[PDB]
Design an enzyme around this catalytic site. Structure first.
Site, PDB file in Angstrom:
ATOM      1  CG  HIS A  12      18.352  -3.628  10.962  1.00 20.61           C
ATOM      2  ND1 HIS A  12      19.291  -3.064  11.797  1.00 20.61           N
ATOM      3  CD2 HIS A  12      18.570  -3.101   9.738  1.00 20.61           C
ATOM      4  CE1 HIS A  12      20.063  -2.244  11.099  1.00 20.61           C
ATOM      5  NE2 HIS A  12      19.642  -2.247   9.848  1.00 20.61           N
ATOM      6  CG  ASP A  49      17.340  -4.623   6.860  1.00 23.64           C
ATOM      7  OD1 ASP A  49      17.369  -5.704   7.491  1.00 23.64           O
ATOM      8  OD2 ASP A  49      17.219  -3.483   7.381  1.00 23.64           O
ATOM      9  CB  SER A  95      18.794  -0.209  15.010  1.00 20.56           C
ATOM     10  OG  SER A  95      19.375  -1.175  14.172  1.00 20.56           O
ATOM     11  CG  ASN A 155      25.058   1.272  12.266  1.00 24.78           C
ATOM     12  OD1 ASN A 155      24.458   0.565  11.438  1.00 24.78           O
ATOM     13  ND2 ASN A 155      24.494   1.756  13.350  1.00 24.78           N
ATOM     14  N   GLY A 193      21.236   3.706  14.128  1.00 22.62           N
ATOM     15  CA  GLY A 193      22.171   4.411  13.212  1.00 22.62           C
ATOM     16  C   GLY A 193      23.504   4.813  13.812  1.00 22.62           C
TER      17      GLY A 193
END
Ligand SMILES: [Cl-]
Length: 177
Positions: free
Chosen positions: A157, A154, A10, A73, A44
């Protein structure tokens, strides 16, 4: 025109935004008629999922360079660094064997993650760049984390407003490559 293939998660695909909202679309527009930018990024994706997608992309696009932006990730899920390192090693082998130049981006976890594990995770990237003798790009997010107005809630990102910055930063990093 030569083609730059992005193999990303992402941070390049865009988190909770359309592909066309993400910085590689901006870069592609900026490099209209000079260099093609193919954004083969999936929100993801682990390093293993990126690796799985790679052969078909190399065949199809015959890129001159591949920007590898993966493993974050894995780190966020506390995977063993040695495993993410081997996966990244395989991606880099694949790129070179397709006659393309890998460009490896340093990835790190945000500054509030535990420091020992973040150190071991982050260390894989300079080790691999040295091993394969390839460019190690700095992690663009280290600049972005410093701007709340460019971060999603979050703390991980980048948001839609960050994307023009990142595209400009990437244009500047990539021109000597
Ligand atoms: Cl860095």
């Amino acid at each position: 025109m030569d083609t730059l293939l992005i193999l990303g998660d992402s941070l390049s695909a865009g988190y909770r935004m359309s592909a066309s909202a993400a910085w590689p679309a901006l870069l592609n527009d900026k490099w209209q008629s000079k260099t093609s930018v193919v954004n083969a990024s999936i929100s993801g994706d682990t390093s293993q999922q990126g690796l799985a997608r790679l052969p078909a992309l190399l065949k199809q696009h015959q890129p001159r360079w591949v920007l590898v932006e993966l493993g974050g990730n894995d780190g966020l899920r506390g995977f063993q660094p040695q495993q993410t390192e081997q996966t990244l090693r395989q991606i880099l082998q694949d790129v070179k064997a397709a006659n393309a130049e890998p460009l490896l981006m340093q990835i790190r976890l945000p500054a509030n993650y535990g420091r020992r594990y973040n150190e071991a995770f982050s260390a894989i990237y300079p080790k691999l760049a040295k091993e394969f003798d390839v460019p190690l790009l700095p992690f663009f997010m280290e600049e972005v984390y410093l701007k709340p107005q460019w971060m999603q809630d979050d703390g991980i990102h980048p948001n839609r407003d960050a994307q023009p910055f990142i595209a400009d930063w990437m244009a500047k990093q990539l021109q000597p490559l």
